[PDB]
Design a protein around this ligand. Structure first.
Ligand SMILES: Oc1ccc(-c2ccn[nH]2)cc1-c1nc(N[C@H]2CCNC2)c2ccccc2n1
Ligand SMILES: Oc1ccc(-c2ccn[nH]2)cc1-c1nc(N[C@H]2CCNC2)c2ccccc2n1
Lengths: 287, 287
């Protein structure tokens, strides 16, 4: 059975995705919510919760309530459209302009995370949710269990004294330090590739090259027939995200200023979707 | 003034070293103790405390009591002999056999830390204490503020899925992962060098080469005149600890099985010092 405190406030309903996620209705409002159930662990949950509570962005999922019981119960706003994954499996093809709308929201979200010292670390189609079944909708990033919070490094502190006793490898690590966030940009790269093309850039399907070797070499599977129907600006951005060198890799800022996203129509549709979401919540304002 | 709870149990006394460390007497026993005062921070203290409470080794400092107040008060067993630092400053020279006795205890201590998933990260003469003013005494490692606890890596967890979305640099980091403890072995290397020779291997004294460059290149300042009076087994062990490559660097096990420490006299003197320390604490045993 469900905890009594949960039951007090919500009627539980069907399962939505896989911990697990159920549909529920909040008694007070009769409105639909999502409830994420994480079995008993605590670190991932405590951080996701601490993160989502402090974060505030249209393309980051918001937490509504939390229950610490025989299991963990996280109450989130519901995403009716489901996983981006479902839109790209079975070589299903997202039309390029839809890719742009989605990816643009993904970039803003991840930019926001990074501005705020958060690295997601597990970005993939499964963790990107669509706000409705419309093809033009808002997307929100979820599943912050694996994320990491940047902070005043032990490295920084170490650099404040004299390295009389300090090992060589620590000093060498200084060259590459502070680029952990770049792992999110690689992931977005892969996600964008998949969205545009309907297939994964790195894969074991019909290769003798190991997955590991394709990834470290940076050599994605380029299928001209499929990519031919895709713009050259799009593929160019993909190429700047799939850069092996983390220091050379495009950041979110560079991605956002890339020509492929200089698209005033797209930004309009997004702004449209925004105020539309917010219509029901808007208080009157001093004019 | 000192907190009332501290005062209740101890009479505070003179300062010993620099947070700060004072001499004190425990009222119950009239015995001397050391009290480490750390101003207000909490992470270093909570970890040192959590570490020292769970650790149990003749060459690791033991905690006696703790006070969480306007400041942090840690009550440790007193080390009458002071810092190893004082024995090596002003080009003062430790006689080789004393070096061996001390370093051997240092190796056991740090081996113990490593067996137990602890990395010290701040080993230097200042953090090595002598148990008495005798030249043949026990040493104990202190100052565990900067230490790190090894645990089930986020890296390990990441390796359990498919890296479809996983950045190249994470995969590359696998080659070198799990050798963080080697930074302690470098430090011991430097400490041993200084003990044997009376001077630092890496230094800005009379060089145009940057400190950073000497360390990453591995090129210590070798002064034959000073080292001539030093055994060749000793210098050999030093050389195996000052290895730039962390994977090639001697571990504590390798250091302990190095010929320079195959010295039955030395181990005897150490065992002697042990049972001697413990004489006052020994309960009778079933024979
Ligand atoms: O509607 C939601 C609201 C919030 C969250 C969420 C926030 C933080 N973690 N999960 C998830 C859902 C959510 N999650 C789903 N599947 C998972 C698989 C792992 N990635 C998402 C899902 C799947 C199908 C339909 C609706 C869904 N709604
Ligand atoms: O007698 C002690 C017992 C325990 C500890 C300790 C344990 C954990 N942190 N510090 C230190 C002392 C201790 N510490 C000293 N100086 C510091 C400078 C930083 N490194 C040690 C010291 C210096 C002179 C004479 C006695 C001393 N006793």
């Amino acid at each position: 059975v469900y905890p009594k405190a949960l039951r007090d406030e919500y009627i539980m309903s069907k399962t939505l995705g896989s911990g697990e996620v159920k549909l529920a209705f909040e008694r007070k409002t009769c409105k639909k919510v999502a409830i994420k159930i994480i079995s008993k662990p605590a670190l991932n949950v405590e951080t996701e919760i601490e993160i989502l509570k402090k974060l505030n962005h249209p393309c980051i999922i918001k937490i509504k309530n939390f229950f610490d019981a025989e299991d963990y119960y996280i109450v989130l706003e519901l995403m009716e459209g489901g996983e981006l994954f479902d839109k790209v499996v079975g070589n299903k093809r997202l039309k390029e302009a839809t890719c742009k709308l989605y990816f643009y929201q993904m970039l803003l979200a991840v930019q926001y995370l990074h501005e705020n010292g958060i690295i997601h670390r597990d970005l993939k189609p499964e963790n990107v949710l669509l706000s409705s079944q419309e093809e033009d909708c808002l997307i929100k990033i979820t599943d912050f269990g694996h994320s990491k919070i940047l902070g005043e490094t032990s490295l920084m502190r170490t650099l404040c004294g004299t390295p009389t006793y300090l090992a060589p490898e620590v000093l060498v690590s200084v060259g590459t330090a502070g680029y952990n966030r770049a792992v999110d940009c690689w992931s977005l790269g892969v996600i964008l590739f998949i969205c545009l093309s309907g297939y994964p850039p790195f894969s074991e399907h019909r290769t003798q090259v190991s997955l590991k070797d394709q990834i470290t070499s940076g050599k994605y599977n380029f299928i001209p027939e499929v990519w031919a129907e895709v713009s050259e600006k799009a593929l160019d951005l993909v190429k700047k995200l799939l850069v092996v060198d983390p220091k050379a890799r495009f950041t979110t800022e560079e991605a956002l200023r890339h020509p492929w996203l200089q698209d005033e129509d797209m930004k309009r549709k997004f702004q449209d979707l925004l105020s539309e979401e917010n219509e029901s919540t808007a208080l009157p304002q001093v004019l």
